[PDB]
Amino acid sequence: VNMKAKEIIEFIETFAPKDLAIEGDNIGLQVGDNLDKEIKKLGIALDPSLSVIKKAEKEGVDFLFTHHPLLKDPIRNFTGVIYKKLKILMENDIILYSAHTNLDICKNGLNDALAELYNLENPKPLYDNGLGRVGIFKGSFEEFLEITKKYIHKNPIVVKSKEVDDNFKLAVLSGYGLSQSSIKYVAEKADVYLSGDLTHHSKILAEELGLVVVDATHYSTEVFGLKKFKEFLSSNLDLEIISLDF
Amino acid sequence: NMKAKEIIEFIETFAPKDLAIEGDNIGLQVGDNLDKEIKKLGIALDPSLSVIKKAEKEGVDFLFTHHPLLKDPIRNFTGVIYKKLKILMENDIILYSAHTNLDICKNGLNDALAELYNLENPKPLYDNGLGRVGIFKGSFEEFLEITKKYIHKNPIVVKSKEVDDNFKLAVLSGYGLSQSSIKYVAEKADVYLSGDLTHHSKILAEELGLVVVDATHYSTEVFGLKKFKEFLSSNLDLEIISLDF
Amino acid sequence: VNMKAKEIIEFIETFAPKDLAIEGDNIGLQVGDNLDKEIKKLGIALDPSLSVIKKAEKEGVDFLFTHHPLLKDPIRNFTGVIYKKLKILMENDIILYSAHTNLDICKNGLNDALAELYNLENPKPLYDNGLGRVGIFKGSFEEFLEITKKYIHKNPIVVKSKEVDDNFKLAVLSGYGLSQSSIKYVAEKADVYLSGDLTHHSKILAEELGLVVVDATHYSTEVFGLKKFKEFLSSNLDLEIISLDF
Amino acid sequence: VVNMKAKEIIEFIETFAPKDLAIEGDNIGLQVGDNLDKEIKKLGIALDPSLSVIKKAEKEGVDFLFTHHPLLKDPIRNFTGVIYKKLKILMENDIILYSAHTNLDICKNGLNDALAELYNLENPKPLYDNGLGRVGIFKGSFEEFLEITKKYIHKNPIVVKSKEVDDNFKLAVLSGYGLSQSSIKYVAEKADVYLSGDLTHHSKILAEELGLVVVDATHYSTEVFGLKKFKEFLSSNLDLEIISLDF
Amino acid sequence: EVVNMKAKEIIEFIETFAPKDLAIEGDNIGLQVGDNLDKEIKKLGIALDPSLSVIKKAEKEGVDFLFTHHPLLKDPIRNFTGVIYKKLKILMENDIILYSAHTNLDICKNGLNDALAELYNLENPKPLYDNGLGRVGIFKGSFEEFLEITKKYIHKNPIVVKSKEVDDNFKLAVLSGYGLSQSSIKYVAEKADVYLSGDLTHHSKILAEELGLVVVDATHYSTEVFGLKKFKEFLSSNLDLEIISLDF
Amino acid sequence: MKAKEIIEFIETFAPKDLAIEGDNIGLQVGDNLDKEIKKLGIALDPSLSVIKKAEKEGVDFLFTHHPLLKDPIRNFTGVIYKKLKILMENDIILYSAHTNLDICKNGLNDALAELYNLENPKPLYDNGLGRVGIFKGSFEEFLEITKKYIHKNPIVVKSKEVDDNFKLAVLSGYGLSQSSIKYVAEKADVYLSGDLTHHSKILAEELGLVVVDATHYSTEVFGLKKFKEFLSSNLDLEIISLDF
Numbered sequence A, C: 001v002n003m004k005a006k007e008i009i010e011f012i013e014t015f016a017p018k019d020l021a022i023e024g025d026n027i028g029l030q031v032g033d034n035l036d037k038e039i040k041k042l043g044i045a046l047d048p049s050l051s052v053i054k055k056a057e058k059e060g061v062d063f064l065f066t067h068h069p070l071l072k073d074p075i076r077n078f079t080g081v082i083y084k085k086l087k088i089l090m091e092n093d094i095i096l097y098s099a100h101t102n103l104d105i106c107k108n109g110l111n112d113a114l115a116e117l118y119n120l121e122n123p124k125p126l127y128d129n130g131l132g133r134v135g136i137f138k139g140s141f142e143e144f145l146e147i148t149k150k151y152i153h154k155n156p157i158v159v160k161s162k163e164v165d166d167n168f169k170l171a172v173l174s175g176y177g178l179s180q181s182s183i184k185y186v187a188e189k190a191d192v193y194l195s196g197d198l199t200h201h202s203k204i205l206a207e208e209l210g211l212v213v214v215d216a217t218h219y220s221t222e223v224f225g226l227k228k229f230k231e232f233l234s235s236n237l238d239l240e241i242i243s244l245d246f
Numbered sequence B: 001n002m003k004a005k006e007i008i009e010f011i012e013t014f015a016p017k018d019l020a021i022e023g024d025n026i027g028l029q030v031g032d033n034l035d036k037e038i039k040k041l042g043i044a045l046d047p048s049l050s051v052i053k054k055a056e057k058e059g060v061d062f063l064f065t066h067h068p069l070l071k072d073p074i075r076n077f078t079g080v081i082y083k084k085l086k087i088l089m090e091n092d093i094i095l096y097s098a099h100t101n102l103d104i105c106k107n108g109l110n111d112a113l114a115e116l117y118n119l120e121n122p123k124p125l126y127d128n129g130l131g132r133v134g135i136f137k138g139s140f141e142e143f144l145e146i147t148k149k150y151i152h153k154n155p156i157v158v159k160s161k162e163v164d165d166n167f168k169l170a171v172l173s174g175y176g177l178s179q180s181s182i183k184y185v186a187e188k189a190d191v192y193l194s195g196d197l198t199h200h201s202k203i204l205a206e207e208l209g210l211v212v213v214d215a216t217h218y219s220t221e222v223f224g225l226k227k228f229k230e231f232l233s234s235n236l237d238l239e240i241i242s243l244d245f
Numbered sequence D: 001v002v003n004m005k006a007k008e009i010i011e012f013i014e015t016f017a018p019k020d021l022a023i024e025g026d027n028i029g030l031q032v033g034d035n036l037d038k039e040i041k042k043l044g045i046a047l048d049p050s051l052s053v054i055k056k057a058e059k060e061g062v063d064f065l066f067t068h069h070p071l072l073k074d075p076i077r078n079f080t081g082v083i084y085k086k087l088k089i090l091m092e093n094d095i096i097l098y099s100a101h102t103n104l105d106i107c108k109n110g111l112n113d114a115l116a117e118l119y120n121l122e123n124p125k126p127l128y129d130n131g132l133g134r135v136g137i138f139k140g141s142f143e144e145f146l147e148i149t150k151k152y153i154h155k156n157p158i159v160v161k162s163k164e165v166d167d168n169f170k171l172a173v174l175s176g177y178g179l180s181q182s183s184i185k186y187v188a189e190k191a192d193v194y195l196s197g198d199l200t201h202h203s204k205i206l207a208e209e210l211g212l213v214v215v216d217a218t219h220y221s222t223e224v225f226g227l228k229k230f231k232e233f234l235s236s237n238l239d240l241e242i243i244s245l246d247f
Numbered sequence E: 001e002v003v004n005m006k007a008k009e010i011i012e013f014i015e016t017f018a019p020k021d022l023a024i025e026g027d028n029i030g031l032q033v034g035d036n037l038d039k040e041i042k043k044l045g046i047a048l049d050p051s052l053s054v055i056k057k058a059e060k061e062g063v064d065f066l067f068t069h070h071p072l073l074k075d076p077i078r079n080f081t082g083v084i085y086k087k088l089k090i091l092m093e094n095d096i097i098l099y100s101a102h103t104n105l106d107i108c109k110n111g112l113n114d115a116l117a118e119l120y121n122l123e124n125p126k127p128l129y130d131n132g133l134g135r136v137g138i139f140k141g142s143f144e145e146f147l148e149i150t151k152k153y154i155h156k157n158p159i160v161v162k163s164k165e166v167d168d169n170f171k172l173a174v175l176s177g178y179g180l181s182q183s184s185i186k187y188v189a190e191k192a193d194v195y196l197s198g199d200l201t202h203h204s205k206i207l208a209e210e211l212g213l214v215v216v217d218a219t220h221y222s223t224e225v226f227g228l229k230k231f232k233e234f235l236s237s238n239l240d241l242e243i244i245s246l247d248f
Numbered sequence F: 001m002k003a004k005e006i007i008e009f010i011e012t013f014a015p016k017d018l019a020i021e022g023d024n025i026g027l028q029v030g031d032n033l034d035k036e037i038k039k040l041g042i043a044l045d046p047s048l049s050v051i052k053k054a055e056k057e058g059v060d061f062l063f064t065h066h067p068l069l070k071d072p073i074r075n076f077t078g079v080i081y082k083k084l085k086i087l088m089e090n091d092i093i094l095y096s097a098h099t100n101l102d103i104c105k106n107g108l109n110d111a112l113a114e115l116y117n118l119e120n121p122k123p124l125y126d127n128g129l130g131r132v133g134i135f136k137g138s139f140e141e142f143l144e145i146t147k148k149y150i151h152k153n154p155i156v157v158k159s160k161e162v163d164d165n166f167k168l169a170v171l172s173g174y175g176l177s178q179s180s181i182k183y184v185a186e187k188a189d190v191y192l193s194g195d196l197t198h199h200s201k202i203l204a205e206e207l208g209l210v211v212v213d214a215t216h217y218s219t220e221v222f223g224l225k226k227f228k229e230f231l232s233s234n235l236d237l238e239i240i241s242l243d244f
Ligand SMILES: [Fe+3]
Pocket: A068, A174, A175, A176, A218, A222
């Protein structure tokens, strides 16, 4: 009737194998010791934030799955916010486990979810490492925008660098894909780039290159696919599953 | 009648180059003969392709920008950088930048923000001299109204906690909302006004209880740049126009 | 009535200022959040080992002072031994604070304690960074060994590289001072080197250089001064103070 | 005689000297240019994209400037002085500047092969692992080797005569700068005589210690020999006016 | 029967037994000091360390080829004074060749780690590390029997960190030389119940106790000399050459 | 004289702290510095032929400008074996003063500045390497001095015309790196140094810097001869030169 933590981890890693993760990505077990324990309640979150972790404790979550890792940069002192987070997780024996870029890259992962939403014709990986998707959007720019506003984020920032003809090349990248080097790279591959976390220098670069950029936010472009992932888990596992920051 | 070198001298008197932080690519970006006579000065935030085309169109012969032309060095000349350099060289337009030295100098871009908010006892925010922090003598709502009226009509507010009157306000013009900046400024201020907020930084601010106001990179720098432009206009017998503001 | 964690820390840092610590040394607060909390029982240990931390919990220690830091190398995952250690400290809100090389180097610190035991004439810092002491031992090698056996370690390992005349130059370094580069450096400054943690290649180097090495162990050469430090805290603070691994 | 698009010239050149033959880090390919559909009437070839070469190109109506050496080895982020003057000339005239560097040194019938064939090296092999240089037996006397050097490459090469050289010796050749201290040490294990360019003092001393005979026929002349072969090759195959600018 | 050998023939024989490509990355194996390898060799000396006393003893005993396990230098130098001056002077004055097989001798079949694995009759032995250093397998006996073997054949009073109880038929890891660094302790704690090696220091002792890994320090010197004696016997059996040991 | 006293005299003239970062100056090969020295040899290079000659002529202390090794080693075979064997077997001390001798007062760069009688000489680089000042004469007069005192057939890169009373930079040894050409072109009309190579020649032409390559060997040996005379005037020692 009940699942062990290691069995949940096994199921997740079958869906999104850890070796799909890009170099250096802190995927896998973040916080935990005994993985033979039976799990009462699974929580899903975009971020292992202090609010999310307090909510997990509040809601009786003992297996906390997040997309973003707890720490990118390693530390050797435990004070302030990280102290408050670890204290809640350790005192309550809550396991924290992450699937980050392996969940972005895998089949039916976060980037596939976007490609399917826009029904990309002949989709291909955007980067060599498997991040992102690119293909033809069979419709007008205005229809593309409507889908974006309806399903992802209502007031996306649009950098309308040039006019966009019907049946354009659409690149999608869930999360933060709007770095300067990404703008330069994707400008060679697509007419329109849908992603998150636009900043000023990247906006200027897109305008110079004629790449239309749509910032539908880091949060919404990932949560769209995370919601799919949650349904997938719910359909397949005999486990109570809740979302914490979406 | 003014030579390019005396415009440069005037600017460098206001914002000495050694105020720029280590590694900042400040000073002459593109140019050769600085004895050249300058009839029309253009000021811009960005040396973008459209700014450079506009410079050429308006007959600008000295183009001042806040952001340097290149941050990372290159050794091939194709695409966008080719198009930009071709316009500058073809018209012998001098391109000169004052970047963090203009952020840091007295009455520079960060001081302009500190003065707008009338910060009491203002101090540099970082050791390298970037940013300002001091007491805002008023309510958070009064601080917001000033922001909306003079800087940006609808800033993003990450309202991480309640803010009492006479709070500590830190300001940094441009991009000051990196993850390490959020962590640092959270120890020094109740409210942080800057530009270019992204997701991980928003989350950090909420965790730390630092209220962040993103009035955009563009608007927080342009506010002080306009003041810098009027200063140049008051002191130089030169036609001076702005190109991207 | 009770003193706060921050005033215990202030007292310690007055004796051994953090800026005395050598470059890269992970000194100061290791684990903790609220330093305004009141402290009823201070525990002192050489090592923040798992057994020391369990003993702290068992004995009701709320402020754990150790000489060695919890971590030298930073981490970004929390499992196994470090998980168990942090869990005990955090669930019980035990503060862990360390003074490492700043306690080695400061006046009347661990190296001064050794120099004073041997009544070194005109003692000087051994290294430029302030680690270790060197001066004249006004007596015979045999008298020096008897002092070592009575006060530090009952059976020290002696690498008797050459004969030692009376009134020789003695270098002392508490803890691990017997690295290969230290042997070479100290051989130019002393006839006899008293420290801890001898290994094979260092023994050979000492023999080649004619440097007499006395390994009284890493543990005993630090514990000697740590006891002095504990007495000093006990004399000055109105606090219950116990030792955990000595 | 007809006009060619710039991209068609680049294609031909890269067929002869593929870019993936260039050693790690070498800045080969398009140096300065945007539109490669540009129509080319006159191709200029040079060893160096020097200021005098580029001025000569402008003067002579060159539309496509090929050089062996890249314009920049180390990247820059300011454009003043000499580089400003060079770019201004190239951009004002939209002259394309393209380079094939070590990929031209290494390819079949490239600059090093040209030397190896000149000396009729028996069973020639690549000298370095990366494919630079050639080494094989010279079937003749040291004096005959020197005469060949004098007749075809450079009239008065500097000879570091570290030891006597017997007939049928192992000869290593490297066009351009091949006389670094580390090259001397490496080649001394592989050859009796080393023909290259740009000898300096420490390298001379090292060669004398190791007994390696070094012949400095100069960086310029050892590359220009093969570059002339390359120019002749282009002229035979392309219906283009082709001129040389610094040789 | 007893004859002279050229140095290159000795080197070829040693490298057949312990190929240089077995040595781990960065290990300074091979020719340490020497020029002409056609040199005729009458007397081969074997040592753990190319120490000053070993090199003096080599000179005194007329050793023409000095084999050592540890290389003369780990870190490169560009000045020649003090002890290294004294050492090189003795070798060069007498043209004594100094040659080393270090981790290639640790790793090769019947090398120093195999010697330990065979001594403890390890069941189904495997390399302990990826690079081939060390061996690990089941010790078919009690911990006390393991300890008895250690005391009789390796070192009489080994330091024992008895982090936990050890049942019969436990997993034993062995590493000849210095194998008791902190990172080795952490690594081996996942692969064995008991770790036999040398050069224990305080931090490593604490870590072993935390992890429950039983550590036996039978010393760097003795855990290598055990296999080096085997190696010497092997050379003596195969080469018609006078062979002596210098620091064992 | 003891070796340590010779070393003391040299280091008083050319303190080791004047040497640039990373320069391997001081004792190269030696143990006992109480050794009695009857005969001192001076050389530019501690080459194998110099070291053989030192042995042949009975030299006890070998002073060289260039250090024995720039890059460290951990094996001793081939040429370095042969060199060390000669020095150690004979306990010949090898000691070097390299850039500290280039930089010190009346050192190798000052020797050149004094030969050309440079007006108001200044160090060329911040680290003290090289000298620059006005040459009070014609380019042709400068060339004549160069040919008579330094090197008979210097290579001249005549990048532009040179007027009388021009700014002259001098650097003994290897001063013609690409980065040096660019730097010096801002500070001088004419650059006198050694070891010219192709790319540096092209840069000098582009920049209009006249470069005179009087060779690495001759521009250092000129000042080394002066140093040898200075040692000879002051020390009661037999002193010979080995590669000049
Ligand atoms: Fe993300």
